[PDB]
Design a protein around this ligand. Structure first.
Ligand SMILES: Nc1ncnc2c1ncn2[C@@H]1O[C@H](COP(=O)(O)OP(=O)(O)OP(=O)(O)O)[C@@H](O)[C@H]1O
Ligand SMILES: [Mg+2]
Length: 506
């Protein structure tokens, strides 16, 4: 009855020699071998001073060795804290000071700098490079495989993951053993994962999608994964002939649609394509079906809540919707101000409750207090509606709402009209300070190669818009850009645009 996530995963192993992970080089690691690696590393953590409840902070390139570190930390009763690989030394300083880890694991090339940051909280530093070598690996080589998995309760912490930083400075989400186990167990059944599944794993592992959804679902299912260091469209296309599942973000799908190799024939061995972590546009969903004949299954989750909703595996997968609430999860829509539930179909604040919902923000009990309703529902910060069939539709983030001359403007519906114009790849709509209207609706528009940006084209876009947008929804300015700013996970970073273009109306 140990709730420890590692114990749930591995204490009963009825097929130990089954493949768990194939590495980028083609080496194959069984379940038993993965478990024994985790034992070695758990013993290393204890030898480097880990006590139960301590954080282990990890900034490394992706490798099976890094995945093992996650499993070992959890196994040893520690609290695993992965960190964006792209964070600079100064950026990293905040997270280490916030979390106060006992152990920091970093790239060998960053050791001297990170050791200084580590000294402030008295942390021991080990290294792990892109090839899986380093001081962590040296210590693990002579360590014992046997390890008594630490007894943990359902509500004890297994991880702290920092949010992506999209709306503001990243917050540390305290995730329990039951949060992670309950969610992945539900998804194994909901997505019909079996031991025959082979997951193409091309997502980073400092984020909930690549770390938990991809890994835990595969491991509970007793399937395997092909563990690639990054997204590479030609490698992914090659592997589909011998894999069954891809978990991706919308940009994976938009990129793959640009390959002339993406055909029915090339994808025909595949069981399931999943999209998550950012809005999969309805037109992309339809473009994928027209080109490949597969219907992408989209799901919606957050760092704080793991997965909340999912289009059904065996039901309608609806373009532009993120599906009903998962088994065990409750989802409702409420008036942002008052907090009362709205009728089905009305746009409001999405709130969720369930064993998937985290225990709070690390060392932010006030912020935590403000984001839970008295009845325990978590305020997502995402606006949307739930239709009559129970499917959640996400209209946009609350922070992205633009208030202009007295009117609420929802940037997704403007972006959709703009994106419909031939010549437009995609658009991002924000408000920036405006002396007349308070905030001015501003459209940032990425063009196809064949089109040149001009004031004339901007007017033609506005003319196109236009009959389909209420006067008050019309952008006060159109700005052509080479590319939208995105984070390492592919999510548009509207705060980047708000800062760069803050003075356009001055
Ligand atoms: N399928 C989806 N469709 C639309 N939006 C999605 C989907 N999946 C995730 N999201 C968005 O991503 C958010 C979760 O992202 P994440 O936990 O990575 O941190 P963030 O919200 O981007 O950053 P921060 O919380 O620091 O502002 C959700 O709250 C939602 O806004
Ligand atoms: Mg967020």
């Amino acid at each position: 009855m140990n709730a420890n996530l590692f114990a749930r995963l591995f204490d009963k192993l009825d097929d130990p020699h089954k493949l768990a992970i194939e590495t980028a080089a083609g080496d194959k690691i069984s379940y038993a071998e993965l478990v024994a690696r985790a034992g070695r590393v758990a013993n290393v953590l204890v030898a480097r001073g880990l006590q139960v409840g301590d954080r282990v902070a990890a900034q490394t390139e992706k490798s099976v060795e890094a995945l093992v570190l996650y499993l070992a930390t959890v196994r040893a009763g520690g609290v695993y804290l992965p960190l964006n690989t792209a964070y600079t030394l100064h950026e990293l300083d905040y997270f280490i000071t916030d979390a106060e880890p006992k152990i920091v694991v970093c790239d060998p090339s960053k050791r001297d700098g990170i050791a200084a940051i580590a000294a402030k909280v008295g942390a021991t530093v080990e290294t792990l490079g892109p090839d899986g070598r380093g001081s962590l690996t040296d210590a693990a080589a002579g360590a014992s495989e046997a390890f008594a998995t630490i007894d943990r309760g359902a509500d004890d912490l297994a991880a702290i993951l920092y949010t992506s930083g999209t709306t503001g400075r990243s917050k540390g989400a305290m995730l329990s053993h039951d949060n992670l186990a309950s969610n992945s167990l539900t998804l194994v059944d909901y997505w019909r994962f079996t031991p025959d599944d082979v997951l193409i794993h091309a997502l980073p592992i400092y984020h909930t999608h690549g770390l938990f959804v991809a890994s835990n679902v595969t491991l509970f299912a007793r399937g395997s994964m092909i563990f690639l260091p990054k997204f590479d469209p030609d490698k992914i296309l090659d592997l589909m002939a011998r894999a069954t599942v891809l978990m991706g973000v919308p940009t994976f799908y938009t990129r793959l649609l640009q390959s002339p190799r993406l055909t029915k024939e090339t994808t025909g061995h595949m069981r399931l394509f999943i999209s998550g972590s950012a809005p999969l546009l309805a037109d992309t969903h339809r473009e994928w079906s027209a080109k490949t004949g597969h219907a992408v299954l989209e799901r919606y989750g957050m760092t704080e809540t793991n997965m909340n909703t999912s289009n059904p595996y065996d039901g309608d997968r609806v373009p532009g919707a993120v599906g009903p609430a998962l088994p065990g999860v409750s989802a409702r829509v409420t008036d942002p101000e008052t907090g009362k539930e709205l009728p089905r179909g009305d746009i409001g604040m999405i709130e969720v409750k369930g064993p998937n919902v985290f225990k709070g923000y690390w060392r932010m009990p006030e912020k935590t207090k403000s984001e839970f309703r008295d009845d325990g529902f978590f305020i997502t910060g995402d606006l949307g509606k739930i239709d009559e069939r129970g499917y959640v539709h996400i209209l946009g983030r609350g922070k992205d709402l633009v208030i202009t001359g007295g009117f609420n403007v929802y940037p997704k519906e403007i972006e959709s009209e703009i994106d419909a114009m031939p010549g437009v790849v995609e658009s991002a709509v924000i408000g920036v300070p405006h002396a007349d209207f308070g905030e001015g609706v501003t459209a940032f528009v990425v063009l196809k190669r064949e089109f040149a940006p001009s004031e004339i084209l901007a007017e033609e876009l506005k003319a196109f818009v236009k009959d389909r947008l209420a006067k008050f929804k019309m952008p006060k300015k159109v700005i052509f850009v080479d590319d939208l700013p995105r984070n390492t996970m592919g999510a548009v970073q509207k705060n980047v645009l708000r800062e760069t273009y803050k003075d356009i109306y001055k």
